[PDB]
């Protein structure tokens, strides 16, 4: 039931590799729960059962707006239709966003790994984490779903 891929317990290594032209990223992605200490490092999966294999991945990066070229800075330049690339082991899938939610953030789709349509990668930003809810002040969010 549960996928077991190569996720390497050592939250000090790469386990894959994100990349988009929309918004020239191109950055790793460690194998734990989105913490802010950790994603310092760069970005991680938003939760630390997440594999390289659910149905769906969802990653948290940062979004430094004094640096266009981050993790999730430029990520909000991208816009739909914007497909990407996960990289893993010896091997790199393919998405195709259709269905942006950055709008409102309480929508039918703050994880969508709970639905039951096909593989899909859901985006999440991370910054100016606030301590008074011990969560992410600001989150946009954004999915996408395999395509042909």
């Known amino acids: 039931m549960q996928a077991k891929p190569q996720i390497p317990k050592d939250k000090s290594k790469v386990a894959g590799y994100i990349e988009i032209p929309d918004a020239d990223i191109k950055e790793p992605v460690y194998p734990g729960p989105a913490t802010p200490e950790q994603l310092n490092r760069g970005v991680s999966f938003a939760e630390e059962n997440e594999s390289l294999d659910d149905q769906n991945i969802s990653i948290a990066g940062h979004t430094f707006i004094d640096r266009p070229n981050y993790q999730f800075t430029n ?34 789709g703050v ?30 969010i954004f999915v996408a779903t395999e395509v042909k």
Not at 122 to 137: A, H, Q, R, S
Request: glycine content about 6%; hydrophobic content about 25%; charged content about 40%.
């Open 111 to 140: 994880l969508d790994e709970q639905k039951g349509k096909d593989k899909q990668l859901t985006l999440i930003t991370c910054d100016d984490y606030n301590e008074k809810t011990g969560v992410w002040e600001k989150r946009k």
């Open 75 to 108: 990520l909000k330049a991208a816009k739909k239709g914007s497909m990407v690339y996960f990289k893993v082991g010896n091997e790199t899938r393919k998405y195709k966003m259709t269905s942006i939610r950055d709008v409102k953030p309480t929508d039918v």
